[PDB]
């Protein structure tokens, strides 16, 4: 099922969608435009959206660092369930709370 995955959306559309339809903590995954094969997480937080690159090497998935997973759903679920593990440089967590359905 993977309801949080939006196959046909760009980053600017993801942004607008999270701002209109979501709450802070709402997030979604989409295909990368910047790198075909990869994915991107788009996450609403404090009324704005941050985007996070997801590496698909073919073997495994990760966030260009951090722990590696066999599938996209494993990566997303892991970061939904380990909130301290996803943080920017400044120390703020990027919280994947509420999957925004397509």
């Amino acid at each position: 099922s993977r309801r949080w995955f939006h196959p046909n959306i760009t980053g600017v559309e993801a942004e607008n969608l999270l701002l209109t339809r979501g709450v802070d903590g709402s997030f979604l995954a989409r295909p990368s435009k910047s790198n075909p094969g990869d994915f991107t997480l788009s996450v609403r937080r404090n009324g704005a959206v941050t985007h996070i690159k997801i590496q698909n090497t073919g073997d495994y998935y990760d966030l260009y660092g951090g722990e590696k997973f066999a599938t996209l759903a494993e990566l997303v679920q892991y970061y939904m369930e380990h909130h301290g593990q996803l943080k920017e440089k400044n120390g703020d967590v990027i919280e994947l709370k509420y999957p925004l359905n397509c």
Binding site: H51, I52, G65, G66, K87, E88, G91
Partner: peptide, 9 residues
């Protein structure tokens, strides 16, 4: 957009 930089463990 805007791609955030991550701190791992």
């Amino acid at each position: 957009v805007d791609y955030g930089e991550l701190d791992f463990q």
